[PDB]
Amino acid sequence: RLMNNGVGKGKTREDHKQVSDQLYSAYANGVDIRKLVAIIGEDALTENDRRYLQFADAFERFFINQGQQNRSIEESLQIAWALLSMLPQGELKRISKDHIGKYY
């Protein structure tokens, strides 16, 4: 429920609230593709999918696991950004460019 609370400047970094939502739909439309592959024909699906495809993997077996080991909101968010990079900046429509120029 809560989340658009306790986020933003002076409490945490100010790009947090934003970088949520991007990811959300991104990952979303990844698996979404993977469904339809198995129906008509895998490579009969839109070519500008294959990246969004691979993007689902990264968040997948690259990120989620982290075994046992202490983590930090800092170290987290750092690699939270890592996620975005591969997909263009011109495809990130739920975040402003200032934080993009904060990092990439």
Added chain:
Amino acid sequence: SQVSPTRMNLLQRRGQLRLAQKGVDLLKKKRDALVAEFFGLVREAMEARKALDQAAKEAYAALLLAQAFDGPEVVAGAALGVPPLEGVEAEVENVWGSKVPRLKATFPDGALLSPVGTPAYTLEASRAFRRYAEALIRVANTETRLKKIGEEIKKTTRRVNALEQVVIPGIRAQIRFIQQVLEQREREDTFRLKRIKGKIEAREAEEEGG
């Protein structure tokens, strides 16, 4: 929008599962056959094709002792040996979605029988059509088969999946939905009946003792 009915339908939707479950049991191995038969054709296709395709040019391109610039003369000169450019015997054959038609034309193409004496190299060079053309007809009926068998294969397995991870687990959930819903109703039974007892006896120990 609606849920189901409420009873008996349990049994019917069970025979829904029977229909599905068993149906899809066999639904693969319908296709097992066709995939089986498929390999032979995959093998067969290019064999003669590659061989005489290369042997068409063999002399053809390589006998231009006149034939290239007097190719003009000869090529004119011996042109249209038998060019109907037709032969269609249209064939229909089992293919899903429409039994697609295939066909063969069947007429010559030239090779040592062509009109007039004329030079010698010519006729043999003309012979080459047997080995591009005639032979190339083989792929005209085999190469289409690959795609046709594709259609089936694909479409079929397409359903396998769907059935297997859409239909079945949903209708699975149908069965449940009934089940429990029947059950909680059955509480009421118990409770109502429950109350009846308390009364019948509570009432009666007062007549002979009070």
